[PDB]
Amino acid sequence: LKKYTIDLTERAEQGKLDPVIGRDEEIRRTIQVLQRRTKNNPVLIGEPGVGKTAIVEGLAQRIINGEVPEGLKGRRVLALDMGALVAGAKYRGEFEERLKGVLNDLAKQEGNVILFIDALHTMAGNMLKPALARGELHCVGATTLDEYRQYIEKDAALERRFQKVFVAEPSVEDTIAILRGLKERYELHHHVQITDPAIVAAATLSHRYIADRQLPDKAIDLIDEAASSIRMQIDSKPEELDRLDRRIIQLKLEQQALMKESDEASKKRLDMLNEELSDKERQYSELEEEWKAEKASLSGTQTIKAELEQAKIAIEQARRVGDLARMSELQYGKIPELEKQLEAATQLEGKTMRLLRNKVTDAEIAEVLARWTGIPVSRMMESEREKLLRMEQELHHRVIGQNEAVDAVSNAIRRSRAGLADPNRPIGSFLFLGPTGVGKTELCKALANFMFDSDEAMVRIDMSEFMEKHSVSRLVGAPPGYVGYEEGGYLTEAVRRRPYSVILLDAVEKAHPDVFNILLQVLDDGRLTDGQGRTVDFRNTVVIMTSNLGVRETERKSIGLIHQDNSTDAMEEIKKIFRPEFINRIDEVVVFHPLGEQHIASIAQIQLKRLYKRLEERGYEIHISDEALKLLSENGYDPVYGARPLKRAIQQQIENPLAQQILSGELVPGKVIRLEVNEDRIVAVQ
Amino acid sequence: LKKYTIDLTERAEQGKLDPVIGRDEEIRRTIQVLQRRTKNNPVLIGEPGVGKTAIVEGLAQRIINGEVPEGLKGRRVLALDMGALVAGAKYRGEFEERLKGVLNDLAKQEGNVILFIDALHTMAGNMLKPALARGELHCVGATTLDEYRQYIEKDAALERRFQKVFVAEPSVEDTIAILRGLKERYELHHHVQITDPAIVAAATLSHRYIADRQLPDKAIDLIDEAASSIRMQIDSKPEELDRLDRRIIQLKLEQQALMKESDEASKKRLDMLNEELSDKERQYSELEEEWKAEKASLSGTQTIKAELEQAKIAIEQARRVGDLARMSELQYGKIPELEKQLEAATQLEGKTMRLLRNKVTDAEIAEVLARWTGIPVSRMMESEREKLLRMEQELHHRVIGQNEAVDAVSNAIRRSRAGLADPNRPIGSFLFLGPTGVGKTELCKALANFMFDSDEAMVRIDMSEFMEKHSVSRLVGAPPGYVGYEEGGYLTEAVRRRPYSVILLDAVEKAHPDVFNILLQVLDDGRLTDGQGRTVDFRNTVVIMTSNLGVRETERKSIGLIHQDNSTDAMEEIKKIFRPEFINRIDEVVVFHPLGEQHIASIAQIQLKRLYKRLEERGYEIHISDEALKLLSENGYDPVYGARPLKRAIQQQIENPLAQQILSGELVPGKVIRLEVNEDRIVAVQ
Numbered sequence A, B: 001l002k003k004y005t006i007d008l009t010e011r012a013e014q015g016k017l018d019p020v021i022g023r024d025e026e027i028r029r030t031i032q033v034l035q036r037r038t039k040n041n042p043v044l045i046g047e048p049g050v051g052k053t054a055i056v057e058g059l060a061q062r063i064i065n066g067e068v069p070e071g072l073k074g075r076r077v078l079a080l081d082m083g084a085l086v087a088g089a090k091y092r093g094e095f096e097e098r099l100k101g102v103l104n105d106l107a108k109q110e111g112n113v114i115l116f117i118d119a120l121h122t123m124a125g126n127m128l129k130p131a132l133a134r135g136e137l138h139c140v141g142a143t144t145l146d147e148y149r150q151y152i153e154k155d156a157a158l159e160r161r162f163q164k165v166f167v168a169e170p171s172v173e174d175t176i177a178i179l180r181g182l183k184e185r186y187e188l189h190h191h192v193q194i195t196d197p198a199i200v201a202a203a204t205l206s207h208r209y210i211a212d213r214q215l216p217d218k219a220i221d222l223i224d225e226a227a228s229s230i231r232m233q234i235d236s237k238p239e240e241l242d243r244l245d246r247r248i249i250q251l252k253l254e255q256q257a258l259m260k261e262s263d264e265a266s267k268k269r270l271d272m273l274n275e276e277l278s279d280k281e282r283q284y285s286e287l288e289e290e291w292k293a294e295k296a297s298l299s300g301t302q303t304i305k306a307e308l309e310q311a312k313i314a315i316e317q318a319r320r321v322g323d324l325a326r327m328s329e330l331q332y333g334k335i336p337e338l339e340k341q342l343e344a345a346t347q348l349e350g351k352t353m354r355l356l357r358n359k360v361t362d363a364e365i366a367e368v369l370a371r372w373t374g375i376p377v378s379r380m381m382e383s384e385r386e387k388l389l390r391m392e393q394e395l396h397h398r399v400i401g402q403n404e405a406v407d408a409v410s411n412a413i414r415r416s417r418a419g420l421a422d423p424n425r426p427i428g429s430f431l432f433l434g435p436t437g438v439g440k441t442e443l444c445k446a447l448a449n450f451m452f453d454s455d456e457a458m459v460r461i462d463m464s465e466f467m468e469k470h471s472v473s474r475l476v477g478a479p480p481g482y483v484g485y486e487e488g489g490y491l492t493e494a495v496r497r498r499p500y501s502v503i504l505l506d507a508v509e510k511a512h513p514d515v516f517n518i519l520l521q522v523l524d525d526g527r528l529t530d531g532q533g534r535t536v537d538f539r540n541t542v543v544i545m546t547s548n549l550g551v552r553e554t555e556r557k558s559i560g561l562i563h564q565d566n567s568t569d570a571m572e573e574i575k576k577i578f579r580p581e582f583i584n585r586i587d588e589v590v591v592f593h594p595l596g597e598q599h600i601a602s603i604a605q606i607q608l609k610r611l612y613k614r615l616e617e618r619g620y621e622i623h624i625s626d627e628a629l630k631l632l633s634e635n636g637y638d639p640v641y642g643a644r645p646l647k648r649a650i651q652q653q654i655e656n657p658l659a660q661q662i663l664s665g666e667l668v669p670g671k672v673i674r675l676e677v678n679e680d681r682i683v684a685v686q
Ligand SMILES: Nc1ncnc2c1ncn2[C@@H]1O[C@H](COP(=O)(O)OP(=O)(O)OP(O)(O)=S)[C@@H](O)[C@H]1O
Pocket: A018, A019, A020, A021, A022, A023, A046, A047, A048, A049, A050, A051, A052, A053, A054, A055, A118, A142, A178, A181, A216, A217, B156
């Protein structure tokens, strides 16, 4: 027992370990397990970073304070040491001799040690199950749920002797009570000051966007590491003193260079640099000496921090012994004086700590979490009126015409960012009708590039492939007997990879109606459960649906024809192909129009602009008359596609004779091109 | 104590560590990890040779300069001494005894000395875990990726003990700056001079051809071995001296035989050999003397290297301790003068160096890599445009005929590699018709064997197989839960293995127009989604499509008649059977004709080559009459299948009775065979 167990109550007796904060329902709960005659060995169940070892240790603090119930007193938690057990040796068989010897040793201690085990399922078990079953060994185990189920949930010793009690992770305010629990410990680790929006924003946003790990832990190493970064920033010499310091080192060692001067007559002219030397000396001693004043302020601050910690260790040892006159002479004696000189120190640091910032901001936590997640917290919390009001201009950068669409859609996005919508629905539910490549593709990449900040959030799934009855098994999930019964279909994998994404559904009318029913279910729910066996949320994505029934009616219906016509017979075609309660579950019915010749001209322009970039690579620009712009305007257009042969007319009239000529060497970089017209085409000239 | 530890800091103090170049950021991140109290122990995660130990030692250089922040002021780093554990460990158990005792007197140091351990996955050491749980020491680790992932991913304690730090393989340019750093160390240790394009081209070729190692280490080995080999040339006796040494030692053996003369008219002739001894000994003496002159001057400039480096060491320690008159003494004093007569020595080699060479150049680099890889210096001095011009000639070496294809397609490949169009396209997107066995895969393996230097970049696709809905399931992949998804798409298999491929397609019009549309997605964007759905990028890959619908008119338009008309009536029929989108996708509408009659004779003797090898292995030699060759040309040729029946017509017609005649003994080895013509059969004649 000298070799294999750590007395946790000893380190609690030195105050070497932190107090637990909160979670006394779990503590009392475990106390309600420890009382028990059989199942003397409880099983903690929880995730990493939860606090279960702190449950054990604060339980030991309740032991050493005697605040545990009577009879539970008299026994001492000495937890099983990791790596004292096997431990490390050349042979096999040592493991069982050590197991035996510690069982004889706890046998001769007569229960007065209660034995905690970290990670029960890893640490076999031959001599264990009898002494467990007798109840003589009053140990304690702790593991996770899933690794219990895979270590095993099943077998008779494990389910027999033990009692599983599981926990939750704490709530946001609960984590605030945690950080207000241990913030003094981290402050004397850190010697900084702490803002309250830093910790409530840390718990809230770390709660929201970190789905992997759990409370409290992600908040803990956010606050800890960020505060360490502030320690490194503070404890280094100030950057103005650094930028001065480099040229001042340069003049003081250039002074070393110019003491033994070669020409006292010819290089007597150096005395200007001797005067600048003295000026940099004066301003240098001023800036440095200001920083020494900061060092005196921060030094006295850390002293009254430390002496307040000594007052708290003293008052708590007075709680352990129960010396009440000692408690009064401490709490009236030391504490209010260090409180008032604390407030004088903090108001003085509110005054003169101009250059250095002991206070940490919520903005620091935003920067560190941006360095983990990748999203800037500017994008969370800039002027939301700036981005949300510039959104229309953002669209009319790369999506031309189509004002009604960007209005209704954009306002829907606005009230989505409001939070006024249902948290039991996906974000945006939209139907689009119109030609392809005229801006639909631009709309998807544009909007995912706006909110989801990249074009990658778009997921295209065509429904033209999905015709037969088996199409639902294709895109959703397979039946058994197949690997797709572990894989699922396309959609579940798509949102399964990208939680924050945009879903695109092309030519959606061709499918069987069995598709359309679960389409109604993802319209109602924002959830669906796959062949694999998991629920997949859609509360962080927007479904975008396109059909091509009345797209040969959408080329004509806008602008110049009535929406009641194509709405009547195409909603009638919905009545053939859906029920319009599905239309009740889409949010908007959005219609597009073909482009005016000015739009077509401008998308020819911005289509050329990337070629102007790639000639900016080589060293060229290009000037084009409205004649040749009418050639790309006429040849780049078709009624069936709109803008899709634009690249075709451009490459076929332009890219091949032009870069033909650069493969002839006829074109000199740094000499500008003007694409002047040919006979009836485009030709190139330097 | 003193026995059981290496201090790195006293080594960087005594210059025993190496200077580091350009890794500040991850050092800063490392300090940000090290300032924590828990999980404060970072793990360097990167490939071997990447710079991890150098990051450690350069951090110790910031220690020994005091450049560290005041959070890490005065803290110590001492490296592990495993060899002192086994020093004196006379019996088993004493190793772990000194391990724990050294762990104790380190454990009383308590954070002042911060340990580094490399190769942490190698580290028993379960006993080292609880002292880490106490934090009585402080550690830095360094291991690999999957070592970590099998290492502390399992131990939930150790993932709370540690933390990831990644170091990627750096820029080429900072690696050049690293060589700028230690180039004084390697020129001064290695006695020679090095130019900067040796560093630059060493980085370019070393980065290009060897990715198995990492930066910087491969370039370090190139420079180290390279310049050390130049110094081996300096050591080695020159070639005039050793050729003359051969001639004098033969002159001493032969003349010594002539000195012990017996014959009158034969051996009294020896005086001409004696004056030849006078000649070769004088010339050997003079070239010998000039070699001692070059070794004299080069020895002198080596001494000035040592003297100037002593000025560097003395000025650096002079800047450490701050000895003022020593800094003015050395800086104003030795280093300008030693640079003056240093330039007298480098100018002195600037004239006098005729016999030996000392400056490290790019030819030396190409030699040293040419002696590692065996890849010739011709390959490395090949520019892009060099093989772009050599494409016609080099493929005409293998593939004679089809000058349309090699010349025109060679122009097309120069256009694609040069930058004609949008880079989001496949490199080669054309149509290459022709019957089977007349040059198709011949030209495929020719192409990939030219531009990718191997035949293996090939996959062939049959559209006539692909008439169904499992077509797409075959070539690009079945959906999940379907047959063939285990095979996937064989296209996605070979392209997913080799991204630099050449794709063959066969008889395109027999397929379904889904594959014309999947095909149309291929010819656009330089990409495609597979049956799984993820993108398969095509911008590094040439596709080749045949159609056998011109088979008989291809085999008649083969010898003599121009093959442009095959291309154009191919545009007639194929334009009729297709849509003009796909027609505008392909750039050159090509068709592979069968070879000429004399070219058929060339193919025939090409197959005869290995046969004649087998013959002259045994002393045989077949001559062939051109007429019997012509009978093979009309016989083994198929107007349907080209010359595919020709090979089986060779073995089937002649070779089995040829085996009966060689094996008969009738045909005698050591004798010429001519393929004379006894009757309509071809029968060999001795
Ligand atoms: N409610 C809490 N009160 C105090 N500290 C807590 C609390 N929750 C978590 N912690 C801290 O979070 C860290 C991890 O919790 P632990 O006490 O080690 O238990 P754990 O998360 O279950 O880890 P285990 O038990 O080894 S799997 C410790 O530094 C705890 O002090």
